[PDB]
Amino acid sequence: AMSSVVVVGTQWGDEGKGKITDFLSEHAEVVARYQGGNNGHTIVFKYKLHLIPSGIFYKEKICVIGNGLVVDPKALLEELKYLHDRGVSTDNLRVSNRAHVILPYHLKQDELEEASKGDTKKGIGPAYMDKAARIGIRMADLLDREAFKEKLEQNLAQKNRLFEKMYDTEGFSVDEIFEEYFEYGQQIAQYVCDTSVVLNDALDNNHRVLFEGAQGVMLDIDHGTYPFVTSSNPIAGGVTVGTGVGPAKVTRVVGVCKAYTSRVGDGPFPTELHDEIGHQIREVGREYGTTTGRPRRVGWFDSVVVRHARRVSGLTDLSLNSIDVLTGIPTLKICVAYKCDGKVIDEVPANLNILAKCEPVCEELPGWTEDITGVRSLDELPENARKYVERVSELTGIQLSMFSVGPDRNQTNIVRNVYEA
Amino acid sequence: MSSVVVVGTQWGDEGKGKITDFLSEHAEVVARYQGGNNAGHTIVKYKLHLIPSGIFYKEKICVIGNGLVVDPKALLEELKYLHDRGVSTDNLRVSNRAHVILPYHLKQDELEEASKKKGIGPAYMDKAARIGIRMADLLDREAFKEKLEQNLAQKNRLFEKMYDTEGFSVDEIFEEYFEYGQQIAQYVCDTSVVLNDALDNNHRVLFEGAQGVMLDIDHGTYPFVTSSNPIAGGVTVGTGVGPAKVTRVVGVCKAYTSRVGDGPFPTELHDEIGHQIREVGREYGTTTGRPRRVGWFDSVVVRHARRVSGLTDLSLNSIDVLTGIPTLKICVAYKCDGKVIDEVPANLNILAKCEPVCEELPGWTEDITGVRSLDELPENARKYVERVSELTGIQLSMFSVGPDRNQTNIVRNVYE
């Protein structure tokens, strides 16, 4: 009777994973992150979390940072101090002894690599690069005085050559990093353990386990719009590798999807709206970067993209958000296919130059006028709004399990309980 | 659904080759999901490196998933190798998202090792750095040229300034490798669509790991590991299929442990028992000629492998090698600085201090190479096999009493 749930955005972020994650967190017994670094979820139990999973506020819930993450131990301690200063207990935290460690040379490397390009702040990329190269320092290494110093000496030998000779800049001595960072590790040691054992024990004993993806599917390093992606795998498959659990133990995957598409980046965007409709969707949907203030690009729901997400991330359940934003639009469109070089295709091209030539083939649906912001069940939707929601499910092949008609908690309507099998 | 993953549970040489050859006969699709052109067991002898095992059967679709790194020149050599021997390859499919190994990756590989080699590591590093060139880029004249220009602008600084050595001009690589792409184009497609189609229509699909679980970049003896994830979870990421579509995972274990590297090896035997196992088991590198280290079965390692690779089925191999050893041992825990533990330490300095705590079982004396059923095994050999399964938590699905195919005894059908 396995009871695990993965929650992930199906698009390029800003899908509203936050509200759904908060909900599923309440009913979880264990909550785990499985990839990424100190990237941010904004809750008021006002709190913002970066590395620590969202179950931390509940004393009884075990929170796991899996082996798939890269951890800045300094930033992690800042995040812990932040919680403690707000009266939040963190004894429920578990940190993987196999997670990789972000060190000061990763931050400098990050800056230097970014400034050399003409086409990335916290050293996450460089940490993942060291992992692939097999020179990375792991949490277990940081906890060993002799091993930490030795790997630090070996890596700085190479990193300092890179800084001094390729980038004409100062490197780091071993003593600028060693005692400072060893001490950080000592403060984290109480949480460090075999997290694969922790998770498998919880899973095998039928506990409710929630895995939280940090970025959206289209930002996946393998399956997203590479290279404008994150440096890891937020797809549900990433859970298996990122925490060390078998694929048979990941039961349900909730894909969080918005009723329309949004993008922050500048890449190809088949269903983009440049007109008054996109203006209305943007204004009503408040599609502006919360920290940057920059407007997001908006466009129609793209079911080619979402079916792609269903395949690569094994989506089983759909949470459809921001449905209210489409009110008062007489003709709604959903992209069902792409016209490319004169051919009709149903795949997301891996080549962005090909993605850029893709014109959407769309279904038109009639819109509605009623304020659906008060709606609390499918039966309360006006006919055209329900038919729109049903069509999204039908087109994507994913069963509806939640829909949202506003930003509030009570405006998330549960159609199906994803913890029960 | 009817999908199987086959993976070595140890550090290679478990004998997954026999097991893969058997499962690929009943498979309709065979797929690779990680690694590069750095594998292969003999299968008229054939050695495959990048191309999955099903290629010899015209009607079986063979897939190289998005999780691999592909040296296009090497792949064409492998294709030619097969064609020269009458083997059709129309059944091959290559991910349009697989990453491409280029000549600068090979030089970088050499330079990096000399500082402390098929460019597999450097190609995974470039993937992580998001500057990698993918199969879809290689097929695009303008894209390839542009990405090559950008990358060589950085790689040439690395080479000239850090390694005081020559780099590559764009033209040294462009025309040669674009040509290679044009020869591979016919096979290139969305392999996630291909596999999900095969899976949804109930076809038998086999995924084969390239290295053992203890060489996994996350879960193995880091840093002495491969540069990707041969664990069964690697299938989800490496081919773009959901966890729910990976139904059975066969862990291939040898009845005792072997290692090639010189790192920690808790159950290592240095005595006459080690000598007997090495000789009877032919525990030498087939290419290097070098003797492998051998030791008792280690269930601490295999329980770790069960967790991290979601093993559902056990293939136990080379059981006949343990014949004639009166007292057989299985390690079930480690004593580590006076503490008794049952996890594999993530830190190698700690693993190096692990002393085995062992169960002991009586051996057998009879030749078992002709045995074709659990019921025909001598008592103490059946007991040993059963105990391995009891201690690791993995049900027995195959066992082997010799190198030949007919000495692979099937207990359950993993495709059912």
Ligand SMILES: [Cl-]
């Ligand atoms: Cl080894």
